[PDB]
Amino acid sequence: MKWLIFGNKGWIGSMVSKILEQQGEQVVGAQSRADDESAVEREISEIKPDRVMSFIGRTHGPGYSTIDYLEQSGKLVENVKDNLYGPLCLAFICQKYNIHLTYLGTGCIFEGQNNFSADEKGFTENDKPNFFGSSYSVVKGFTDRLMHFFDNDVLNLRIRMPITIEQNPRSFITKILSYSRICSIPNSMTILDQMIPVMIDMARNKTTGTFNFTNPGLVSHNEILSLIRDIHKPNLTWENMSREQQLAILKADRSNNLLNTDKLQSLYPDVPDILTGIREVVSKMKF
Amino acid sequence: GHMKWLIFGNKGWIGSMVSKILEQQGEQVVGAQSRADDESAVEREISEIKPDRVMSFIGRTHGPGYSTIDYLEQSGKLVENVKDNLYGPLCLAFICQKYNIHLTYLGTGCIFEGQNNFSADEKGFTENDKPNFFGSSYSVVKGFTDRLMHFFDNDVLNLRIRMPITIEQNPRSFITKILSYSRICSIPNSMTILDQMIPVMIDMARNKTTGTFNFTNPGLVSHNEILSLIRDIHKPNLTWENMSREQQLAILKADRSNNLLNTDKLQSLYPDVPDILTGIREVVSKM
Numbered sequence A: 001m002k003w004l005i006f007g008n009k010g011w012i013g014s015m016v017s018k019i020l021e022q023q024g025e026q027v028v029g030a031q032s033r034a035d036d037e038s039a040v041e042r043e044i045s046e047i048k049p050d051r052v053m054s055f056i057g058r059t060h061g062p063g064y065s066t067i068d069y070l071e072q073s074g075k076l077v078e079n080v081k082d083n084l085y086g087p088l089c090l091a092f093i094c095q096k097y098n099i100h101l102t103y104l105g106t107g108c109i110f111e112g113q114n115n116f117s118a119d120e121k122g123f124t125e126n127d128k129p130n131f132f133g134s135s136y137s138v139v140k141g142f143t144d145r146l147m148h149f150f151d152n153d154v155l156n157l158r159i160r161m162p163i164t165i166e167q168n169p170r171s172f173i174t175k176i177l178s179y180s181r182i183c184s185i186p187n188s189m190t191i192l193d194q195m196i197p198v199m200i201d202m203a204r205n206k207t208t209g210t211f212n213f214t215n216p217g218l219v220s221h222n223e224i225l226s227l228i229r230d231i232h233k234p235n236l237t238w239e240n241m242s243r244e245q246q247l248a249i250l251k252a253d254r255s256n257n258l259l260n261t262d263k264l265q266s267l268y269p270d271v272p273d274i275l276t277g278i279r280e281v282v283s284k285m286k287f
Numbered sequence B: 001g002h003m004k005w006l007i008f009g010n011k012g013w014i015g016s017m018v019s020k021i022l023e024q025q026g027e028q029v030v031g032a033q034s035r036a037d038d039e040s041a042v043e044r045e046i047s048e049i050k051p052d053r054v055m056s057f058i059g060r061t062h063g064p065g066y067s068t069i070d071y072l073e074q075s076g077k078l079v080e081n082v083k084d085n086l087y088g089p090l091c092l093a094f095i096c097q098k099y100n101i102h103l104t105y106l107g108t109g110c111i112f113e114g115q116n117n118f119s120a121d122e123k124g125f126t127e128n129d130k131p132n133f134f135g136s137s138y139s140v141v142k143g144f145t146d147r148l149m150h151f152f153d154n155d156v157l158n159l160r161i162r163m164p165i166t167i168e169q170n171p172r173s174f175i176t177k178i179l180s181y182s183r184i185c186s187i188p189n190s191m192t193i194l195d196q197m198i199p200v201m202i203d204m205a206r207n208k209t210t211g212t213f214n215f216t217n218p219g220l221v222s223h224n225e226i227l228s229l230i231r232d233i234h235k236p237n238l239t240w241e242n243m244s245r246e247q248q249l250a251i252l253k254a255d256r257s258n259n260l261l262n263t264d265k266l267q268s269l270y271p272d273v274p275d276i277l278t279g280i281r282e283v284v285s286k287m
């Protein structure tokens, strides 16, 4: 089939593009900006893709390798443009043309259920955002809600803290290896090497709706650094800091949660729990 | 004949003014119980009430400690900004469209800068023009809401008002406000006299007119010209101090939109709408 990819030069979009091409699919990198709704509709009307995917957003930039970038005066316009408006333009136009859209969103719109409390099973697909501590998370929360108005037309995948075996400035493990102090908190995370094939399968199948799109279960920064130490780097040591210490040195807070992945597990029962998956990733990693 | 109207923002300055007028015209007005951002509660209320027409007079434009849009520039208020100035209005657009019920959305023309210099080649920002003013968090979000309303061009009436004026003094009224300000940044602007423009808005909603409309009285008026007309007609001892654009920017949390709106589209439908200077004369004579 023919796959039109927005964000195909980005970290994730490049990775997905490569896998679609190894699978024998035709990939078209979108030339239109997602927020240029008239150019998007011209491109979609002309290319006539079988599938559209969105790997776009504004999550770092000059001076800031993190979502702290969006807290600067003058960046709200880039935040809403790339992290809400562009994705909504793709939803409206893909829906009009009856072309399945995969939107790669975020689960960094919730806070909590990550304390191993016996009565808490994690945030669901239907749950409203309850984390408002970064401008990124605020805007993405509304994008996530708005995507529920396209439940039969758009696949809304909530990834978090994405990890690759290959080291990359964007990869959660690369980042935490680089940080002087670690705020260790159990969290739902996405191993892209494991879950990109699932995402492609879902888009091939025209599956629609919202899915929490993390590996089952919780892992902490300390558990990940402990595996790197215990598998490869016996000398490895790090300093811990609290949520409050971290808040003081960043421009924004950070989302910490468990996502309930029962919905994804109903379709894809072989996705590894996050600790089995991280053990696998760390075992294969170069430094 | 007389109809049933569901009003979001029925207790607000503009909403309560429109409610009273629809009631004076012998309509049935229901004040909405649901928050516009509570999409499930909105869908319940619309499906229950089965209104002939829905109207939105909602937004977040002031709050504790800040009688202006400067309120939205505080850390932690982006969530209120997007919730009330974008997401709630989009919830109303999606749901009213689903139920094929006409929606009037009271938007803003404070999404553009320029064309107010009396240059003969500049006839003002049109309905199709994209936002070009990004100097307040209010204007940035409202600009995206305006663009999003264009995806509902057959189902929603999107009216861009600016600097609303009432005969009746009120803290929200542009004339009350500039009378209250020690220093005036005098700039020619498109402005909306609500006493003259609300009856046009109600007619449009009765006719189920949809699309975007610039919704200011035709032409420009400056702060200095309004205050001069108040002095000469009502208050001969009135005096004020003038200040620059950059001097204003030094005292406020954000910049302000200054523009001309092209009102040819409205004037084509309603040739009798008073030009701003004729209308300001009517207003000041009634004060």
Ligand SMILES: C[C@@H]1O[C@H](OP(=O)(O)OP(=O)(O)OC[C@H]2O[C@@H](n3ccc(=O)[nH]c3=O)[C@H](O)[C@@H]2O)[C@H](O)[C@H](O)[C@H]1O
Pocket: A059, A065, A066, A067, A068, A105, A106, A107, A108, A159, A160, A161, A162, A172, A175, A176, A179, A180, A181, A182, A183, A184, A221, A246, A254
């Ligand atoms: C596109 C979005 O990117 C996001 O990354 P974010 O910009 O929050 O990454 P970091 O600030 O590096 O934060 C990554 C992690 O590092 C922790 N940390 C940070 C700095 C420090 O000095 N020490 C620490 O321990 C921080 O608490 C967080 O757990 C998320 O992936 C989100 O899932 C995804 O949708």
Ligand SMILES: C[C@@H]1O[C@H](OP(=O)(O)OP(=O)(O)OC[C@H]2O[C@@H](n3ccc(=O)[nH]c3=O)[C@H](O)[C@@H]2O)[C@H](O)[C@H](O)[C@H]1O
Pocket: B061, B067, B068, B069, B070, B107, B108, B109, B110, B161, B162, B163, B164, B174, B177, B178, B181, B182, B183, B184, B185, B186, B223, B248, B256
């Ligand atoms: C809901 C939105 O409200 C808005 O009002 P805004 O909050 O910008 O009002 P003010 O800050 O009082 O500003 C009102 C006017 O006062 C001027 N001024 C301000 C302070 C000062 O000390 N001296 C001055 O001369 C300012 O430049 C502006 O022209 C707009 O109506 C917009 O059309 C509407 O959609």
